[model samples]
Target: YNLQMDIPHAPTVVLTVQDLEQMEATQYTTMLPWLSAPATFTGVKLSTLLSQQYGFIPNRVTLRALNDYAADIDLSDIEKYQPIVAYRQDGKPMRVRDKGPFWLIYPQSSFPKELNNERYHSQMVWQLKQIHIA
Candidate 1:
């Protein structure tokens, strides 16, 4: 619920865990660049969360980690991969040390060739906190 947005500034917003849970949930098992094996991720789809939760999905946005490390995510990838902002991994609640609270990940198995690459890997940001409309 600590997430923040920079646009739709007429009114600010912050999504809590309960708020996210109230939305449609997605679960997927997939391998990630940092993971030794595939794991199940549970969260809301990026597009759905943006459009439904925030009213609109911009052409581009930046995801910022707790430490401020950021990555710009284009709408094309969001529509293409259907990534999730994960709060659970392997059926267990994620801890900050384990990249918990939130992690933006893709269903790599769905598009193995496209997701299992350096570009996507860099985009798979962990400890995610803020979503800045661009």
Candidate 2:
């Protein structure tokens, strides 16, 4: 006998560069897990990215990648670290090869307490495609 079941998938949503620009933009430099020299990263703060006023208040945000690889980020972590969803690095819009369109960049340098451990580095989602929440 064959069995069939239906499962509900998590709620997911995508945001464009335009949508990202609507939020408060901030600029900062940090030594990324990939980059050696400090690079200037620019984008809107992730705080308002999943804000209640924006139509959704996510308890957990998932950064969906181009290759379908996804990173699950807790709301508390984002609240603590205040990562920036960067669209440009070094004054240029990032392409996929350059880890763009969007990159979940943590304030690794500005805030020493941010920690340079594997946990924070992994949350630096590159080649971002969309935001999924549940």
Model 1 misses residue 111 by how many Å? Answer: 1.0
lDDT for residue 110 in candidate 1, whole number 0-100: 82
Estimated TM-score for each candidate: 0.92, 0.80
Q: Weakest 10 consecutive residues, lDDT, candidate 1?
A: 1-10
Could you tell me how far off, in angstroms, the CA of residue 79 lies in candidate 1 after the best superposition? 0.9
Which numbered prediction scores highest in TM-score against the true structure? 1
lDDT value, residue 10 of candidate 2? 36
Summarize candidate 1's per-residue lDDT along 1-134 as a digit string, tens digits.
26676656556678876677788989999987788888999998989888875688889989998888899899999988899988888888788766878889899888999888888888888888889786
Once fitted onto the true fold, the runs of candidate 2 whose alpha carbons sit more than 4 angstroms away are 1-14, 52-56
Q: Clash totals for all models, in order?
A: 2, 0
Tell me model 2's lDDT, rounded to 2 decimals: 0.72
Clash pairs, model 1 backbone = 1-15, 1-16
RMSD of 1: 1.4
lDDT of each: 0.84, 0.72
Instruction: Kindly list the per-residue Cα lDDT of model 2 for residues 1-134, writing each as its tens digit.
Output: 00011112433334567666677888878887689799999987677665633354467767766776778888787778788889888898887666878888988987766558888888888887766554
Task: Score candidate 1 by TM-score against the native.
Answer: 0.92
TM-score of candidate 2 against the unseen true structure: 0.80
